[PDB]
Design an enzyme around this catalytic site. Sequence first.
Site, PDB file in Angstrom:
ATOM      1  N   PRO A  50      -2.308  13.396  -2.784  1.00 52.99           N
ATOM      2  CA  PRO A  50      -1.782  14.804  -2.148  1.00 52.99           C
ATOM      3  C   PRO A  50      -2.700  15.339  -1.099  1.00 52.99           C
ATOM      4  CG  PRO A  50      -1.033  15.010  -4.640  1.00 52.99           C
ATOM      5  CD  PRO A  50      -2.129  13.692  -4.345  1.00 52.99           C
ATOM      6  N   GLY A  89      20.500  -6.092  10.962  1.00 46.50           N
ATOM      7  CA  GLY A  89      20.007  -7.161  11.815  1.00 46.50           C
ATOM      8  C   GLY A  89      19.314  -8.177  11.337  1.00 46.50           C
ATOM      9  N   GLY A 135      15.565  -2.790  14.903  1.00 43.06           N
ATOM     10  CA  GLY A 135      14.343  -3.099  15.559  1.00 43.06           C
ATOM     11  C   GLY A 135      14.432  -4.370  16.340  1.00 43.06           C
ATOM     12  N   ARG A 136      13.953  -5.455  15.705  1.00 37.16           N
ATOM     13  CA  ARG A 136      14.035  -6.664  16.447  1.00 37.16           C
ATOM     14  C   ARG A 136      15.432  -7.163  17.203  1.00 37.16           C
ATOM     15  NH1 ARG A 136      11.658  -9.491  11.070  1.00 37.16           N
ATOM     16  NH2 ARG A 136      12.550  -7.598  10.194  1.00 37.16           N
ATOM     17  N   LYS A 183      12.105   5.528  16.346  1.00 39.80           N
ATOM     18  CA  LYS A 183      11.158   5.379  15.200  1.00 39.80           C
ATOM     19  C   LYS A 183      10.082   4.463  15.681  1.00 39.80           C
ATOM     20  CE  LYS A 183      11.891   2.396  11.732  1.00 39.80           C
ATOM     21  NZ  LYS A 183      10.402   1.582  11.760  1.00 39.80           N
ATOM     22  N   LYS A 224       4.984   5.465   6.286  1.00 35.28           N
ATOM     23  CA  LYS A 224       5.222   5.315   4.791  1.00 35.28           C
ATOM     24  C   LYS A 224       4.160   5.846   4.119  1.00 35.28           C
ATOM     25  CE  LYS A 224       8.172   1.284   5.416  1.00 35.28           C
ATOM     26  NZ  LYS A 224       8.433   1.636   6.637  1.00 35.28           N
ATOM     27  N   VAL A 225       3.903   7.252   4.187  1.00 38.34           N
ATOM     28  CA  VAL A 225       2.994   7.971   3.681  1.00 38.34           C
ATOM     29  C   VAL A 225       2.853   7.641   1.983  1.00 38.34           C
ATOM     30  CG1 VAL A 225       1.693  10.270   3.366  1.00 38.34           C
ATOM     31  CG2 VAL A 225       3.052   9.554   5.384  1.00 38.34           C
ATOM     32  N   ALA A 226       1.653   7.094   1.776  1.00 35.96           N
ATOM     33  CA  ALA A 226       1.521   6.760   0.175  1.00 35.96           C
ATOM     34  C   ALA A 226       0.362   7.009  -0.475  1.00 35.96           C
ATOM     35  CB  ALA A 226       1.975   5.333  -0.090  1.00 35.96           C
ATOM     36  N   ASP A 227      -0.313   8.117  -0.181  1.00 35.67           N
ATOM     37  CA  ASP A 227      -1.708   8.332  -0.653  1.00 35.67           C
ATOM     38  C   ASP A 227      -1.731   9.316  -1.682  1.00 35.67           C
ATOM     39  OD1 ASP A 227      -4.548   7.548   1.213  1.00 35.67           O
ATOM     40  OD2 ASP A 227      -4.573   8.626  -0.813  1.00 35.67           O
TER      41      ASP A 227
HETATM   42  O1  LIG Z   1      12.563   0.746   3.717  1.00 37.25           O
HETATM   43  C1  LIG Z   1      12.047   0.428   4.820  1.00 37.25           C
HETATM   44  C2  LIG Z   1      11.392   1.319   5.753  1.00 37.25           C
HETATM   45  N1  LIG Z   1      11.230   1.002   7.033  1.00 37.25           N
HETATM   46  N2  LIG Z   1      11.298  -0.103   7.466  1.00 37.25           N
HETATM   47  C3  LIG Z   1      10.838  -0.393   8.789  1.00 37.25           C
HETATM   48  O2  LIG Z   1      12.041  -0.043   9.638  1.00 37.25           O
HETATM   49  C4  LIG Z   1      11.914  -1.258  10.994  1.00 37.25           C
HETATM   50  C5  LIG Z   1      13.108  -2.451  10.650  1.00 37.25           C
HETATM   51  O3  LIG Z   1      12.797  -3.092  11.628  1.00 37.25           O
HETATM   52  P1  LIG Z   1      13.766  -4.582  11.713  1.00 37.25           P
HETATM   53  O4  LIG Z   1      15.240  -3.799  12.367  1.00 37.25           O
HETATM   54  O5  LIG Z   1      13.107  -5.208  12.801  1.00 37.25           O
HETATM   55  O6  LIG Z   1      13.802  -5.323  10.538  1.00 37.25           O
HETATM   56  C6  LIG Z   1      10.482  -1.723  10.817  1.00 37.25           C
HETATM   57  O7  LIG Z   1       9.881  -0.693  11.490  1.00 37.25           O
HETATM   58  C7  LIG Z   1      10.189  -1.625   9.285  1.00 37.25           C
HETATM   59  O8  LIG Z   1       8.574  -1.370   9.116  1.00 37.25           O
HETATM   60  C8  LIG Z   1      11.912  -1.124   6.756  1.00 37.25           C
HETATM   61  O9  LIG Z   1      12.315  -2.417   7.202  1.00 37.25           O
HETATM   62  N3  LIG Z   1      12.385  -0.870   5.422  1.00 37.25           N
HETATM   63  O1  LIG Z   2      -5.864   5.098  -5.641  1.00 35.90           O
HETATM   64  C1  LIG Z   2      -6.477   5.583  -4.611  1.00 35.90           C
HETATM   65  C2  LIG Z   2      -6.862   5.033  -3.392  1.00 35.90           C
HETATM   66  N1  LIG Z   2      -7.681   5.661  -2.534  1.00 35.90           N
HETATM   67  N2  LIG Z   2      -7.962   6.933  -2.772  1.00 35.90           N
HETATM   68  C3  LIG Z   2      -8.585   7.529  -1.654  1.00 35.90           C
HETATM   69  O2  LIG Z   2     -10.164   7.396  -1.794  1.00 35.90           O
HETATM   70  C4  LIG Z   2     -10.579   8.652  -1.602  1.00 35.90           C
HETATM   71  C5  LIG Z   2     -11.194   9.587  -2.563  1.00 35.90           C
HETATM   72  O3  LIG Z   2     -11.769  10.855  -1.717  1.00 35.90           O
HETATM   73  P1  LIG Z   2     -12.388  12.089  -2.840  1.00 35.90           P
HETATM   74  O4  LIG Z   2     -13.552  11.393  -3.459  1.00 35.90           O
HETATM   75  O5  LIG Z   2     -12.496  12.962  -1.773  1.00 35.90           O
HETATM   76  O6  LIG Z   2     -11.038  12.126  -3.848  1.00 35.90           O
HETATM   77  C6  LIG Z   2      -9.883   9.385  -0.432  1.00 35.90           C
HETATM   78  O7  LIG Z   2      -9.906   8.620   0.964  1.00 35.90           O
HETATM   79  C7  LIG Z   2      -8.264   8.887  -0.935  1.00 35.90           C
HETATM   80  O8  LIG Z   2      -7.266   8.836   0.098  1.00 35.90           O
HETATM   81  C8  LIG Z   2      -7.877   7.628  -3.848  1.00 35.90           C
HETATM   82  O9  LIG Z   2      -8.070   8.697  -3.918  1.00 35.90           O
HETATM   83  N3  LIG Z   2      -6.957   6.781  -4.879  1.00 35.90           N
END
Ligand SMILES: O=c1cnn([C@@H]2O[C@H](COP(=O)(O)O)[C@@H](O)[C@H]2O)c(=O)[nH]1
Ligand SMILES: O=c1cnn([C@@H]2O[C@H](COP(=O)(O)O)[C@@H](O)[C@H]2O)c(=O)[nH]1
Lengths: 217, 217
Positions: free
Chosen positions: B71, B177, B196-197, B36, B66-69
């Site tokens: 669509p 861990g 990880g760590r 990962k 952790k895609v969170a934007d």
């Molecule tokens: O819900 C989540 C999703 N992803 N990770 C990620 O998984 C790894 C966990 O690492 P660690 O064993 O060093 O705590 C890191 O890359 C961290 O960003 C979490 O810890 N929690």
């Molecule tokens: O709450 C949020 C935070 N950020 N953006 C981002 O701002 C831009 C908006 O672009 P648009 O004018 O083309 O819709 C894009 O980079 C988008 O990822 C949102 O749309 N909403």
Amino acid sequence: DVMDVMNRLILAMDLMNRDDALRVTGEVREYIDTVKIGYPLVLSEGMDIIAEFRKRFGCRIIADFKVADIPETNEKICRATFKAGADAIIVHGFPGADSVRACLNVAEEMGREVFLLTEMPHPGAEMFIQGAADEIARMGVDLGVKNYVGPSTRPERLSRLREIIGQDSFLISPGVGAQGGDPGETLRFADAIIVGRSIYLADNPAAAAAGIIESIK
Amino acid sequence: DVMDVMNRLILAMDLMNRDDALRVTGEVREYIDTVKIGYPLVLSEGMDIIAEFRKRFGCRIIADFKVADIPETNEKICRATFKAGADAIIVHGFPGADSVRACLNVAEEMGREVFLLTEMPHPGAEMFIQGAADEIARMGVDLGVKNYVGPSTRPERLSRLREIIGQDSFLISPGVGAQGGDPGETLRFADAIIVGRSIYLADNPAAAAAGIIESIK
Ligand SMILES: O=c1cnn([C@@H]2O[C@H](COP(=O)(O)O)[C@@H](O)[C@H]2O)c(=O)[nH]1
Ligand SMILES: O=c1cnn([C@@H]2O[C@H](COP(=O)(O)O)[C@@H](O)[C@H]2O)c(=O)[nH]1
């Protein structure tokens, strides 16, 4: 105080190839001094693109990375982003106070800024984000966050957001144009508006930006 | 079916410099076939690091972004990430169903996988994430998501997660861990554990991985 954004207009540069991104940005460079760069461009061209924009346009760069990991990882993401030259970074509040504080720690150390994302403009935001928005904003206020991002698509929500963060806080708003947000209506509460596709996908970006500014003279 | 992870152990490689990441991963290559990679390494060394890992170790790569934007942006992030060679990508469910579907669309087109993050292991997850976790998991099930990420730090939550997603879904769990999660207890519900760590920060990475696998046989 808070940052000054020229013409209260921030360009959302989400094109994915360096040539087009730099070209289009150059066409509208006279209308803005602040550019928001996200993962679409950074993952396609590399983090060095941030320093390139700052040097070629003398602009402020806001890294729209919607940081949403655990504290330890958030700290690393912020450090790497600021080392690459970003002036500010956008962070999600949904993961909690510790995750936000991790970002604030790095920003204070390096003299940069954190923007707390309170609510998003897309339809899906109504499922979970909308209901936590007010509390996320309050969490930011309680931690001294001075910069926020709120949805232009929901005016009454943006208005409520402004009430929570106070008139002192700096508020920017995306969702203007392509997502349906109105420039004028949005600036009734936000300090600056974020515009992407409406500008970078227009057959004449300069005219598009010029028109937007004309709409808010 | 679902992917097969060697020894049910996934290495979370969050070191930030290429030499160290490749060196440590090489030291434990005999114990894993799935790694990962997150933003700490990618933003520091570039997206090309993904293809480098696949070629140097012949391993599967899960991009923990952790895609969170919104669509449209999620679609772009996923396409760039899969173009870089990632076999799978981790996506947040809190931004809503449309944001998740955007990722699923790209994964289906390119023949890759999406892992839905339901709940996180850090303390801050209690504020907003925990309360939406069951519904986020249900949302994934309703959309056909087959891969999930759940917290090792809260076994009862992980157990509830498994009940929601069913026995056929693939579940991996981080927080083992360093964050306090236990390998054995976690694998009572998860198909594979993420570490990880505890491995990459240890004096002897190979011994660390070897110990984890031993105590889990
Ligand atoms: O819900 C989540 C999703 N992803 N990770 C990620 O998984 C790894 C966990 O690492 P660690 O064993 O060093 O705590 C890191 O890359 C961290 O960003 C979490 O810890 N929690
Ligand atoms: O709450 C949020 C935070 N950020 N953006 C981002 O701002 C831009 C908006 O672009 P648009 O004018 O083309 O819709 C894009 O980079 C988008 O990822 C949102 O749309 N909403």
